[PDB]
Amino acid sequence: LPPGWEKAMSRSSGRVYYFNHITNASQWERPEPARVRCSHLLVKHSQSRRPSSWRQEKITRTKEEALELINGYIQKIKSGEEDFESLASQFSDCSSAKARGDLGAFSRGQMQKPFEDASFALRTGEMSGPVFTDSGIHIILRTE
Numbered sequence: 001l002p003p004g005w006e007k008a009m010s011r012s013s014g015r016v017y018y019f020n021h022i023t024n025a026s027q028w029e030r031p032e033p034a035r036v037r038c039s040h041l042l043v044k045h046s047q048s049r050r051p052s053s054w055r056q057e058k059i060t061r062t063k064e065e066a067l068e069l070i071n072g073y074i075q076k077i078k079s080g081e082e083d084f085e086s087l088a089s090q091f092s093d094c095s096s097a098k099a100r101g102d103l104g105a106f107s108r109g110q111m112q113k114p115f116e117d118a119s120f121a122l123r124t125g126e127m128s129g130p131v132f133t134d135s136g137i138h139i140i141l142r143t144e
């Protein structure tokens with residue numbers, strides 16, 4: 001199995017699924033470049049390094065409330081009810097929101113490590129689960 005992937009058991013259904021401990025992605029089916037290109041949606045919380053964004057001068061939501069918001073956006077994106085770009089534009093606490101959350105291409109050595117590791121472990125087109133850094137909690141979409 002590719003980097004980060006492990007076989008797991010669903011508590012709900014008792015079916016096997018696969019879980020990636022580097023991206024936090026999970027999927028039902030059984031699943032390195034010099035540069036990748038990613039978009040993200042960042043939800044900040046009261047313990048972020050900078051609890052402020054273009055959306056809200058003072059961010060007061062708890063880390064747990066940020067995680068519920070992230071999980072509801074992942075749900076909508078996976079159901080096809082919303083697309084990732086749309087929710088990044090509206091709700092991301094990063095100023096990249098104005099660019100549909102696009103960060104452009106980057107190599108290793110540039111981003112916070114849990115972000116970098118998640119970005120380089122995703123396949124093209126693949127979205128992470130919740131990824132925690134000192135900025136807050138991210139959903140990451142690898143686009144190249």
Ligand SMILES: O=C(O)c1c[nH]c(-c2ccccc2)n1
Nearest residue numbers: 049050094095111115134135
């Ligand atoms: O204000 C912050 O802490 C912040 C805003 N954006 C980011 C960020 C951008 C790209 C990758 C990881 C974090 N951090």
